[PDB]
Design a protein around this ligand. Structure first.
Ligand code: NA
Ligand code: NA
Lengths: 247, 249
DNA sequence: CCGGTCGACCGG
DNA sequence: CCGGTCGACCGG
């Protein structure tokens, strides 16, 4: 993480910030502004990076050659845009925000990528853990990490910022950082219904995993497979059995 | 529907109307409610606005059990209720508020009949997937309860699609569609399991040919739900197990 | 022509 | 500790 070494400074700048009263989205913009100020050469919106990548490679045209620019099957999977979009890219037609884009902010240095995702939380109440990442997308990432031996190329981190209401605006009250690959892979909760999303509040996540990235992957995949079997069996009990008497 | 008869008026006041850019389409939903509140005042309520009135018109009724008695129907209660602690802690000084869970956006009731209006916005500058309509699971439970209690002429669930696009510093509505759920072929509803188990379709293209009974609709969908769930159970092994079984050793 | 992904919420 | 629900998004 390129953000962690300066976390304390971020937590300091955010706490006390205000935004005009999804929902607390604007906070992710403050994180960007601050990350751009103290890590200008590493901070990129995901699309900003893609635009930058294609701009400095004029000779290269067409999706086939443009995909080769990533130089990584995994990063390609996680960052890349569509085929017809990589083909139609140009100076006069750049990449813009995309709702399902993997990362909020991308930090790159020495060929190392940090995929940052900002989660906002309303403290006034005690809600359910938010969507972290697709358990399936993650499952595919690990598989590719293994097929290509890319175990030192990137990290997936999360920054949570809690806000509270105060009049006609929202105010940051807390913050918390956590790395996905530092937590115990076999303990991630997979909410199948909620878009097969992994869920957890950042401030609760554990960070004591002490094995290799390759073991993390392999271990996650076993957890993923298991729960997929459990879900398949429970689906029958909850969505089928209690409704047969109507057929 | 209490909206169908004035669908032309709603469309008229929406098409071409601009709103300053800031969902990014909420403004149109607000415009729909405001119109309805001004042209069918006694029938229009925001889901939570209803619950409060219901509770307010019965001050002597405190405690959840009694308050739950106010709905006079299990099906509706399932669809409109707020839960134990929330229902119990309710007071005139601690009113119900909007909840991003509420089954409906707008409620229109008359002669004890209810219309659950859920309005869908769509950015026409993009050709996107069919959006979430309603939980197939919540639908299945609703159908079970309609049957178990014989409530087949109590309510309807309808949708209003509001098409819009960005134009300079503003947003403008360019079209509008309307459809009734209980008029579509139930065996045709697509249930997207991963997408919160929601049924998905573009209001614009929804079929309205169902000519059978409501009870027949309720039972038909239930069969369709069960089968799809079974089929899904099989799919999951195929997509999320078989191809990754080679990394577990 | 089928379905995955982002966002973030409480009741039990 | 567990897990549905709303919203609205294009590629494979
Ligand atoms: Na995410
Ligand atoms: Na809905």
């Amino acid at each position: 993480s390129f953000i962690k070494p300066i976390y304390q400074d971020i937590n300091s700048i955010l706490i006390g910030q205000k935004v005009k009263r999804a929902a607390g989205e604007p906070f992710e913009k403050l994180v960007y502004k601050f990350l751009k100020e103290n890590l200008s050469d590493l901070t990129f919106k995901q699309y900003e990076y893609l635009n930058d990548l294609f701009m400095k490679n004029p000779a290269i045209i067409g999706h086939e050659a443009r995909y080769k620019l990533f130089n990584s099957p995994t990063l390609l999977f996680l960052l890349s845009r569509g085929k017809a979009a990589t083909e139609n890219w140009s100076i006069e037609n750049l990449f813009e925000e995309k709702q399902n884009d993997t990362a909020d902010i991308l930090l790159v240095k020495d060929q190392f990528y940090e995929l940052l995702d900002v989660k906002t939380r309303n403290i006034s109440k005690s809600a359910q853990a938010p969507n972290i990442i697709s358990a399936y997308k993650l499952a595919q990432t690990c598989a590719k990490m293994i097929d290509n031996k890319e175990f030192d190329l990137f990290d997936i981190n999360y920054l949570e910022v809690d806000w509270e209401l105060n009049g006609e605006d929202l105010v940051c009250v807390s913050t918390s950082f956590a790395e996905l690959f530092k937590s115990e892979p076999s303990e991630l909760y997979i909410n199948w219904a909620a878009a097969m999303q992994i869920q957890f509040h950042v401030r609760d996540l554990d960070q004591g995993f002490n094995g290799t990235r390759e073991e993390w992957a392999k271990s996650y995949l076993k957890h993923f497979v298991t729960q997929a079997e459990q879900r398949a069996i429970s689906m029958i009990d909850k969505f089928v059995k209690p409704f047969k008497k109507y057929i």
